[PDB]
Symmetry: C2
Subunit: 267 residues, 2 copies
């Protein structure tokens, strides 16, 4: 029924509404994680059994981190230890146990541990900022696109990756800078929901810019290894789930580090 | 004469919190140098990631006083560096994969004495490390003398259900001794007489998985030994392998059964 836009229009609002409660964010993350991991793990394994177990592990973290332990390091270790254990049992080949753990390992840090960073950002910095981080990336990719088509080269992106320029990243940086008075006072004049200060603007942009840049390149290197141009096919809009959030993954952690440094405690 | 000098050094490093960090960072240089060197024999490569692995404890404990932040900075830095050095994409994967298992298993896991120290008293901190030294010993005698019902698979050496049980008992027993010899001696709080079983069970069960994981990890790279940094037969990673799993799991247990420190 003229499907691409009947549902490319559906997504955007869904995500945001999930920022309503802390418990809600966990829900989206755990959900984004099932898909994201399903793809990164399925590239290393096409076994009926295997894939699924580790994929369930990857998604379990947010709920364990936020709801059970209210501490991150403990579950991170339980999930990784459980993994290695399981692998020893399933893969009877030793040199192959390595490969599955290596995959599970990159999956854990990059996908699960990184994406889960909205969790601390949410509670420690207000859902407001939480939503700002995720969107700044949606905005970075857009501003870098126009400025990219029109402002030419001094390309940073290698063979295997798509195409990304120093000039192209700068535009997206600016677009983010500008995007935030708008977000800032439209969120602060509107409602007294504390957001980042007018002085922590540059860094946030710089990381949303520089991290998204590295996250996409890492993925292309990650993709190219497994041989595909696309990460996986779980999604409608062209490009799979991991592909959508790749740059975001690096951004969030680094950006939390920045906030933690410049916005103290807001709770 | 390596076996006489070592034992006391380690312990003396439990004198201060800042000291423990020192040993960890140090144990880490060696431990990582070996696990990373098995994936890379490049002059350049190895060294950078090895420095990253060792940086964590100092960042975790002294700078951030929070673990998640440095863990991510070190892993992000790693991926960045790799992209620059390894111009081959399918090869960038391998180095990150290696660096990745190195980060979680060696650095993130060994660093667990850090929380255990501040949140549970250097006393217990020292108990965790030693319980393993003791587990391997008690499992050895009981192992030689009590034979089959083998848990260990092809690739690993040879380990038995009976063998692990003895080491469990040995640990159980080892702790009144540690307990009241540390509590009647000096009022330095240690684990309660009721959190004994779990601690043993994990020191037993985790050390068992950590050594098997390493043999699978060793066998992949083709060596019988992890690396040659050390005097006594067996390299650094080989010494601490089982410990690695134990500490985290054991902290989880303490955190559950010993609450908090003043
Ligand atoms: Hg929603
Ligand atoms: Hg401000
Ligand atoms: Hg690519
Ligand atoms: Hg020392
Ligand atoms: Hg007690
Ligand atoms: Hg082995
Ligand atoms: K990409
Ligand atoms: K081993
Ligand atoms: Mg992206
Ligand atoms: Mg061992």
């Amino acid at each position: 029924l003229k499907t691409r836009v009947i549902t490319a229009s559906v997504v955007a609002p869904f995500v945001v509404l999930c920022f309503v409660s802390y418990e809600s964010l966990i829900g989206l993350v755990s959900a984004i994680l099932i898909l994201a991991g399903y793809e990164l793990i399925t590239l290393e394994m096409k076994e009926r059994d295997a894939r699924f177990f580790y994929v369930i592990l990857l998604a379990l973290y947010p709920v364990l981190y936020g709801l059970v332990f209210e501490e991150p390091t403990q579950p991170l270790s339980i999930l990784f230890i459980t993994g290695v254990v399981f692998s020893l049992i399933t893969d009877k080949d030793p040199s192959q146990v390595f490969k599955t753990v290596a995959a599970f390992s990159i999956a854990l840090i990059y996908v699960t541990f990184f994406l889960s960073f909205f969790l601390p950002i949410y509670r420690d910095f207000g859902a407001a900022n939480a939503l700002l981080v995720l969107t700044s990336t949606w905005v970075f990719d857009s501003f870098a696109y126009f400025t990219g088509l029109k402002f030419g080269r001094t390309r940073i992106s290698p063979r295997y990756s798509p195409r990304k320029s120093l000039e192209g990243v700068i535009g997206g940086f600016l677009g983010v800078v500008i995007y935030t008075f708008l977000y800032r006072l439209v969120v602060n004049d509107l409602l007294s929901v504390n957001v980042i200060c007018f002085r922590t603007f540059l860094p946030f942009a710089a990381t949303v810019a520089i991290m998204d840049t590295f996250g996409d390149i890492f993925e292309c290197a990650l993709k190219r290894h497994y041989g595909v141009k696309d990460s996986g096919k779980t999604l409608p809009g062209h490009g799979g789930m991991l592909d959508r959030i790749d740059g975001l993954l690096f951004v969030a952690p680094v950006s939390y580090i920045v906030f933690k440094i410049l916005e103290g405690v807001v709770r």
